[PDB]
């Protein structure tokens, strides 16, 4: 059994596409969104009260 063989198979191993769990990216937090104002309504109303 040493006479050897022939590997005639043409390899076409295509790797599967890996799974991707997309992140819920957040650029500005809610604190920055509330702090991005020259005038805040809650502060004005509290001062008036």
């Amino acid at each position: 059994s040493s006479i050897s063989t022939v590997d005639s198979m043409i390899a076409l191993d295509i790797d599967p596409l890996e799974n991707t769990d997309f992140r819920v990216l957040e650029l500005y937090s809610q604190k920055e969104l509330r702090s991005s104002n020259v005038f805040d309504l809650e502060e004005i109303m509290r001062e008036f009260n």
Partner: protein, 49 residues
């Protein structure tokens, strides 16, 4: 009855920083960084006197 007060509040200004606004609604048209020698690079529109 005469009473003098000294209130210490927080004021907010947004870029380009050409006016600030205290929490009590004191809208001031003076740049918070105008030091009296950089009027060309900072706004000032309140009364001069």
């Amino acid at each position: 009855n005469l009473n003098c007060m000294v209130t210490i509040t927080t004021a907010r200004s947004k870029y380009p920083y050409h006016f600030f606004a205290t929490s009590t609604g004191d809208v001031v048209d003076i740049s918070p960084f105008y030091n009296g020698t950089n009027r060309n690079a900072s706004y000032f529109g309140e009364n001069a006197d």
